[PDB]
DNA sequence: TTTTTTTTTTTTTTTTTTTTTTTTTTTTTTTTTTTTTTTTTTTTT
DNA sequence: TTTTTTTTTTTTTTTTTTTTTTTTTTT
């Protein structure tokens, strides 16, 4: 008797906020089809692995940090290169100044249809991220270095000028402004950060990141990467041993690892990861340093077993299949 | 608000006193913009009240 | 020493200002969290 | 005895509201 004009007087305030506000402006959860988490490619398949849900989730924010040299710039040139592959539309926001475009092509991007922006202050480089957001049109922008993201205020000033906490408030007015756009044209930002050390504490880390607390709240995800060795053809030095941390998740559990291997002038190694999962899941037998496949050996050390899936695609496209079917905790296919 | 409580401090000083009836009201704290004088701390509901109040 | 004892509107404009220079009169908080780090292996000459 | 006539003119102010944000090693 009471729960029928409880329902009437839902149903009339519902009816109230929908004239006033538009269509979706209030809905139950579990009908909204905006509100399900989208992901694409990182490139790394052991990344998508540790990441649980995939890949990196379409409409959020994206943290990527780490110490110089560590493979910043390649990770994200990969998931463009991945995107435009699925013909998606991507720009790159080079704060630093620093971007090599015939790099770029090498990783596998397509440098005609990439827009590209060398701003000249952290204001103007933030306000192409809103327009190119609201726009609807392009689907994964990266910031290359919050840390070059200088206010207007401290370029038209001196050197030795003081501008305390200037940065972290352009940056905290700014995801206010983001977050709300980038969901509704369901857009991928990705921001790039750099390490600096915090002074006079003894107790947890000295490690810190540029531009203040806003970010670390709206990111979505985080992730800490770092170079862990070198790969070596014998004396010539050919790539990096890379380690990456979810250090923050929002879309599945935090704190997993990814290893891998960057290639200079190839980028990501596929194949290499495809062993090492295919290692871990007994579809390849490994006696010491000699890699098996269904009995046959495949080669001897992880450089020949990765040279033998490349001129057999077959056992290659099966072995992927396998590794996806199993390990993925939510394939889309 | 603040002319709504200029308002009232006319209205009710006369009749508080012709009743002998206490009146106490209570204010929060809010912090003033463009201040480099004094203490920013002001407080809710504009001036009538600072004038009108025997204690404070 | 009077009585009326019932009324109407019926649609408007202004024709562009100054101010003529601000105050203040010295406050507070009232005691936090950390939550656990990396490095990736140098050089001598 | 005998019978009405016709509008006029503006006055005067009242009251505040509310904080934002870190930055960087030294032998
Ligand atoms: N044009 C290039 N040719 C060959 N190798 C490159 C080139 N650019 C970068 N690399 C290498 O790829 C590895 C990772 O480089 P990046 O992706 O630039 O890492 P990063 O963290 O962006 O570094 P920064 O921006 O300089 S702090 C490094 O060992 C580089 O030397
Ligand atoms: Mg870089």
Same mark, same amino acid.
């Given at each position: ?32 089809? +905006? ?7 990182? &490139?790394?398949?052991? %990344? ?10 379409? &409409? ?9 040299? +560590? ?7 990969? =998931? ?61 922008? =990266? =910031? ?37 756009? %980038? ?28 531009? &203040? ?20 053809? &014998?004396?010539? =030095? ?96």
């Amino acid at each position: 008797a009471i729960d029928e004009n409880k329902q009437k007087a839902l149903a009339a305030a519902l009816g109230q906020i929908e004239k006033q506000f538009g269509k979706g402006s209030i809905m139950r959860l579990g009908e909204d089809r +905006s509100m399900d988490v989208e992901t694409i490619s990182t &490139g790394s398949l052991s %990344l998508d692995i540790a990441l649980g849900a995939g890949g990196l989730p379409m &409409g959020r924010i994206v943290e990527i940090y780490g110490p110089e040299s +560590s493979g910043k710039t390649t990770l994200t040139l990969q =998931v463009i290169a991945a995107a435009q592959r699925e013909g998606k539309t991507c720009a790159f926001i080079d704060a630093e100044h620093a971007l090599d475009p015939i790099y770029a092509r090498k990783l596998g991007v397509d440098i005609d249809n990439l827009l590209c922006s060398q701003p000249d202050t952290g204001e103007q480089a933030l306000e192409i991220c809103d327009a190119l957001a609201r726009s609807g049109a392009v689907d994964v922008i =990266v =910031v290359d270095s919050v840390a070059a993201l200088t206010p207007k205020a401290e370029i038209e000033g001196e050197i030795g000028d003081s501008h305390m906490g200037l940065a972290a408030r352009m940056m905290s007015q700014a995801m206010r402004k983001l977050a709300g756009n %980038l969901k509704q044209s369901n857009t991928l930002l990705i921001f790039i950060n750099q390490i600096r050390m915090k002074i006079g504490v003894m107790f947890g880390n000295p490690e810190t990141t540029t531009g &203040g607390n806003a970010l670390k709240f709206y990111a979505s995800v985080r992730l800490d990467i770092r170079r862990i060795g070198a790969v070596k053809e &014998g004396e010539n =030095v050919v790539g990096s041993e890379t380690r990456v941390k979810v250090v923050k998740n929002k879309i599945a559990a935090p704190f997993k690892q990814a290893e891998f291997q960057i290639l200079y002038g190839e980028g990501i190694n596929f194949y290499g990861e495809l062993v090492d999962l295919g290692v871990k899941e007994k579809l390849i037998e490994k006696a010491g340093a000699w890699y098996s496949y269904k009995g046959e050996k495949i080669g001897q050390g992880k450089a020949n077993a990765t040279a033998w899936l490349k001129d057999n695609p077959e056992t290659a496209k099966e072995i992927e299949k396998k590794v996806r079917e199993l390990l993925l905790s939510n394939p889309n296919s």
